[PDB]
Write an enzyme that holds these catalytic residues in place. Structure first.
Site: not given
Ligand code: NAP
Ligand code: UHC
Ligand code: PN7
Lengths: 81, 238, 234, 237, 238, 79
Positions: A40-42, C177
Site C-alpha cells: 500500500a501507499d499512503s 493517481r
C-alpha cells in the site's frame, strides 16, 4: 460464540483488505502491515480505512486512524470501541 | 496616514487575526471602524477598547455575515448611526480542510455559504448604500488558495476563487458610481519551515502587511484601481 | 481519431447543446458515452439512438447532478455496467443573470449550489472510481457567455471562478493517481465585433477541445483552464 | 491523432530535442514538415531521413531564425516549393543562465534577440503568407519561466514572457483572416528535486509537448486563439 | 500619504508625463528624487526647480537608461552623493506602434532594446547597490496604452510582457536581501469619450493616480508584496 | 487651427494603425506611416465622409504628408 464471531469478522476484514490492496487473502494476516508488507501507499491506506468504514458502519477519527498500521489493528478496533 | 475621503468602514469577522489588524490599521488612519463578530463578544470588546484607548473611533456589531437578513440589518443600523457607510471589508471566512474523498457535501456547502455567499451579501449591500453617495471602496479578502488551488482545500479554493471572480463583476456594476471593488490574496500569514522554504522573502507575512495593502485599496491613493486582485504572499505565487 | 487509453465517459447535462455535441464527438472517437438527462428523456433517447445508428456505443442515465445521492449512485451503476469509468465531463451549469442589487441571496445561493456542488460531486466521485485504474481525466466546463456586456454576472462569475479554482485543487489530489483535472471556458457559442475571430463558436469547437483534454494527447496537462472563445478574452 | 486542413509546417530549431519531436509528431499525422537548423546539418539530415523512412514527408532548410532576411527568404522558398505554408512553430531559442549581477547586457541582448525577435519575424511572415488563403495556425514555444520567472533567468524569462504577450497581439492581427496564434508553456521536460514540486511526479516527455503543439495547429482548436497552453504536469496553475 | 524607511529614489525618464508626476508625488512624500533625463535638460531643470520651490528635495541627472555604462555611472554618482540608493523606478520606455506586417525588425529592435534593456540594467544595478543594506524596492512601469483597440501592439506587448516576467525573476534574486520588484501597468492616462467608452470608471486616469500606485509599491506598506503586477486602468482590463 | 489638426490626426492614426505621435504635419502617409494602396483609398473615403468633401484624384496624389491634407480640408470643407 466469541471465537465464531472473531473468525467471521476476520474473514470480512480480510476480504476488504485483499481487494483494496489487490493482494491474496493469505497475505492478509494479523501481523501484516498495509505499506511494508501489502504494497500500500499512503492514499491506499486512506482509501482502505474508508472501505472498512462503510462496510462496518463506523467512523474512525483521523487521530485513531493514524495509528492503524497492520491488519490486527483493524480487527482490534472494530472488535473494540 | 493614507488619505481617505470616506469616514467609516465595516470589517466582517474582525475579532482576531487579519480582520482585527485591518481594524487596528484603519482606526489608526482615522476611520471609524465597525468590528463585526458572530458569537463571542469578549475578544471584539477588548479590541474596541484597545482602539478607543488609543484615541481612535471603534464600535462592535454582532451579526452572522452568512445570513442575508442579519447582514442587511447590520448595515442598516450603521447607516442610521453614522449617516452612511463609505467602506466595506469582506473578511469573514472559515476553513474545513479535508481530502475531497473524505469531504461530505455539507462540508463543501458549509465553506461556500460562509465564505462566498457572505461576500455576495456585503458587496450587494455596499452597492445599495454607497450608490447615492457616488463614492465607496470594497475589499474582498481572498487567498492564494483561490488563485492556485491546494490539496485538501477543494471547498476553500472554490469559495475564494469564486470570491475573486465575483468581485470583478461587482467592480463592473459599481464603477459608474465610483464604487470600487478589489480583492487581496494573502499567502501564508502568521496570525512550517517547509512552507517558508517556498516563500522568496523567506518568512511568513505579518497580519499588518495584509492590513496595509487592504488600507491602500480602500484609500484615495488607489482611486483608479478597480477589478484588481492584489497578491500579498512574499513571492510565493507570481 | 484522437487517442484514448480509457473506454467510456459520463457527460452531465448531455441532452442538448454543447453536452450533446460532446457526446457526438466522443462517441465518434470510439468511447462509450453516457448521456445524463434530468427531466426530458425524449431528447436524450433520440441522441442515444442517433449515435447507435452510426455504429457508436451510447447509453442514457437519469439523475440530478446537484443531488449527492443521485449522482453517486449513477456513477456506481456505470461502474457496475461497464467495469469502471475512465472519463467525466461536468457540464450541468445553469445561468440566471440579474443585476446584483436586484438579486435575492436565495437566487445567488441556488445558482452557486447547482453549479459548484454538481462539479464538486462529479470530481469527488471521479477520484474514488478512477483511483484503482491509476488513470483518468475530468473536464469541468463553465457556462457559456450569456451577456453582451459586463453587467448582471455576479453569480455567473462566482460560479465560473469557483469552478476554475476547485478544479485546480482536484488536480493536486488526483495527480497522486494520474487523474487529470482541467477546465474549459467557452465564449459566445451558438458583440461579435468584440470577438477577434468575428464569429460565434460552434458547439463542436468546444467539444473537440474537451476531447483533447480527455485524450492521451494532453497527458502532461493538469490544473489548466482552456479558453475556447475566439480571442474574446486572452 | 488529429485532423489538419493545412498541409505543411515549418518548425524553427527543429534538429533536436523538443523541436525534433514536434517534427516527428506532426509528420506522423500527415503534415509535410520543414526542419529548420542553423549550424551542422548531420543531425537535421538524420531526422529527415528517419521521418522519410517512417513513410512521412519531411525536408530540411537551413537558416538563422534570428536573421530577418534569412527567415524571410526561407519562408519564400517553402511557399515556392509547396504552394504555401499552413502552419508555423516558433521553437528556436537559447538559454544563457546566470544571476543578473553577473550578467552583461551582452548576455541579455543575445537571449532577447535570439529568442524573441526570431518569433517576431516568424509570426510577421506568417501573417503575410497565410492571409490570402484566410487560413493558418502558429504556435510559439514559450516556457513556464516566462509565466512565473526564475532565479538566474532574467534574460530567458524576459524573452519568453515577451513571447507570450506578443503572441496575443499577433492573434488580434491575424484573427479576421482566420490565422490563429497560440503559445505553449512547457514545464520541466526530459529533453528528484525538480520532480518534488510536480504533482504528476515526473518530468514531461518531449512528445507530450509536441502533441499540445499539434492540438493548437489542428482543426480541433479552430475557436482557440490568443491562448497560452500550460504543459507542466501541474507545476504551475 | 505613505511611510518610507528609505530616503531617496531614482526615476528614469522623469522629465515629463507620468515620470514627472512620480517625481512630484514621491518628493511630496519626503524622498529626495533624482530626475533622469536623456537629451534636453530644460524640462527636467524646471521640474527640479518647481519641486525645490515647493520645499522638497530634488536633483537632476543626465544619462541614457538604455546604455549599460551610462546607467552604471549614474547610480555610482548618486551613491557617492547620497550614501546609497533606496528606491528605483524604471520608466524609460518608448512607444512606436505599427501593424506587424508594416514593422521592420529594426523597428521591433528599437522598442525592445530600449524598453527591456533599460529596465534590466536598472534592476541589475539595484541588486548591487541595495543588497548590502538588506533593503530596497524597485518598480518597473509599462508604457501607457497607445491606441484604442488591439492592433499595432506587437512590440508594445513584447516589451510589456517581457518586463513583467523579467521583474518576477528579479523578485526571486532580490528576495533574500529584502529587495522587492513589482510592475505597474497603466491604462489610458491623461498625459476622448471614445476612449472612456470601454473604461468602467468612465474617465481617463490622472498621472497622479499612477504615481500613487508606484508610491505604494515602493513604500513600507507593500513590504510583503514582490513579483506582483499592479494594474492601474480604471477597470479597463481585469 | 489645432482643433482641426487633432481631429484629422485621430482619423489618420486609427486608419493607418499607428500611435498618434507618429502623425505629425511632416509625416508622409506612404514613406513614414506605411500606408499601402488599400489604406490610401480607405483613408480618402473616410475623410471624404467625415468632412463632406470629394477630392479630385489628381489632387489626392499630391497630398504627400499630414499637413497637406489638413490644409486641403481647411480650404474645402463647409464653414
Ligand atoms: O436548466 P438550464 O439552464 O437549461 O440547464 C442547462 C443544461 O444543464 C442541465 N442541467 C442543469 N442543472 C442540472 C442538474 N442539476 N442536473 C442535471 N443536469 C442539469 C440541463 O438539463 P435539464 O434540462 O435536464 O435540467 C440543461 O441541459
Ligand atoms: P498600390 O499598391 O496600387 O500603390 C503603390 C504605388 C505603386 C502607388 C507606389 O507606392 C508608389 O508608386 N509611389 C510612392 C510615392 C508616392 O506616390 N507618394 C505619395 C503617396 S500617394 C498619397 O500620399 C495620397 C494619399 O495617400 C493621401 C491620403 C488621403 C488623405 C487625403
Ligand atoms: C493522500 C496523502 C495521505 C498521501 O500521502 P502519502 O504519504 O503519499 C496525503 O498527503 C494527505 O494526507 N493529504 C492531506 C493533506 C492536506 O493538505 N490536507 C488539508 C490541509 S491544507
Amino acid at each position: 460464540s466469541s471465537m465464531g464471531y472473531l473468525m467471521a469478522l476476520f474473514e470480512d476484514i480480510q476480504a476488504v483488505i485483499a481487494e483494496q490492496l489487490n493482494v491474496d487473502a493469505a497475505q492478509v494476516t494479523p501481523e501484516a502491515e498495509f505499506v511494508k508488507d501489502l504494497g500500500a501507499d499512503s492514499l491506499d491506506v486512506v482509501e482502505l480505512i474508508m472501505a472498512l468504514e462503510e462496510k462496518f458502519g463506523i467512523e474512525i477519527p483521523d487521530e485513531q486512524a493514524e495509528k492503524i498500521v497492520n491488519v490486527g489493528d483493524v480487527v482490534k478496533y472494530i472488535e473494540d470501541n | 496616514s493614507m488619505q481617505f475621503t470616506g469616514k467609516n468602514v465595516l470589517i466582517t469577522g474582525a475579532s482576531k487575526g487579519i480582520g482585527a489588524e485591518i481594524a487596528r490599521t484603519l482606526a489608526s488612519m482615522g476611520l471609524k471602524v465597525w468590528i463585526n463578530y458572530r458569537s463571542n463578544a469578549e475578544v471584539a470588546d477588548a479590541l474596541k477598547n484597545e482602539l478607543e484607548e488609543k484615541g481612535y473611533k471603534a464600535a462592535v456589531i454582532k451579526f452572522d455575515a452568512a445570513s442575508e437578513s442579519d447582514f442587511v440589518e447590520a448595515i442598516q443600523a450603521i447607516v442610521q448611526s453614522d449617516g452612511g457607510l463609505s467602506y466595506l471589508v469582506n473578511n469573514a471566512g472559515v476553513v474545513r480542510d479535508k481530502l475531497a474523498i473524505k469531504m461530505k457535501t455539507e462540508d463543501f456547502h458549509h465553506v461556500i455559504d460562509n465564505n462566498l455567499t457572505s461576500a455576495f451579501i456585503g458587496c450587494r449591500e455596499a452597492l445599495k448604500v454607497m450608490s447615492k453617495s457616488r463614492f465607496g471602496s470594497v475589499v474582498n479578502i481572498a487567498s492564494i488558495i483561490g488563485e492556485r488551488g491546494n490539496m485538501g482545500q477543494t471547498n476553500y479554493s472554490a469559495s475564494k476563487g469564486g470570491m475573486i471572480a465575483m468581485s470583478k463583476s461587482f467592480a463592473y456594476e459599481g464603477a459608474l458610481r465610483n464604487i470600487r471593488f478589489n480583492s487581496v490574496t494573502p499567502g501564508f500569514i502568521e496570525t512550517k519551515a517547509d512552507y517558508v522554504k517556498n516563500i522568496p522573502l523567506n518568512r511568513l507575512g505579518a497580519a499588518k502587511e495584509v492590513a496595509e495593502a487592504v488600507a491602500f485599496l480602500l484609500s484615495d491613493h488607489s482611486s483608479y484601481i478597480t477589478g484588481e486582485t492584489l497578491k500579498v504572499n512574499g513571492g510565493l505565487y507570481m
